[PDB]
């Protein structure tokens, strides 16, 4: 048992809003989720055999999210507003992995439902953070390939 640390940081917080705005022709990659209180979640690495990714592109030639979330892709359609990415109706298929980082397709959708906060860093080297309505934390690298 040191001491506390003192204080020394003055500064704002990170991420910027004008930012959300671009969320449009962009892609990220799902590398670690925390829960509200702090609960670091168990995800799938890219070592493992299926990662997160998330891919925004008018693919379908309509602004339609796309990605692979567990083991299952995912699509749906988005919006931008507020600093954030709102989410249309999403969903997947119903593939299985019989793996940890499969099934957390479902806990994965039940997380863009609830998109009350967004943080993204534009500034290199890029790494978007989605924050939930309870206060839960997803940290995703930029992927541009």
């Not at 925390?34 to 602004?63: E, H, N, W």
Request: aromatic share 6%.
């Amino acid at each position: 048992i040191p001491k506390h640390p003192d204080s020394e940081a003055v500064a704002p917080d990170p991420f910027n809003p004008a930012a959300t705005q671009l969320l449009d022709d962009t892609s990220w990659v799902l590398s670690a989720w925390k829960q509200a209180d702090g609960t670091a979640r168990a995800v799938p690495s890219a070592d493992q055999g299926a990662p997160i990714t998330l891919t925004l592109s008018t693919s379908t030639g309509q602004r339609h999210a796309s990605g692979f979330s567990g083991c299952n892709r995912y699509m749906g359609s988005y919006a931008l507003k507020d600093g954030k990415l709102s989410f249309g109706t999403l969903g997947g298929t119903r593939m299985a992995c019989m793996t940890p980082g499969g099934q957390i397709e479902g806990a994965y959708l039940n997380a863009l439902t609830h998109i009350d906060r967004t943080g993204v860093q534009m500034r290199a080297p890029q790494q978007m953070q989605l924050v939930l309505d309870n206060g839960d934390t997803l940290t995703f690298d930029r992927s541009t390939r």
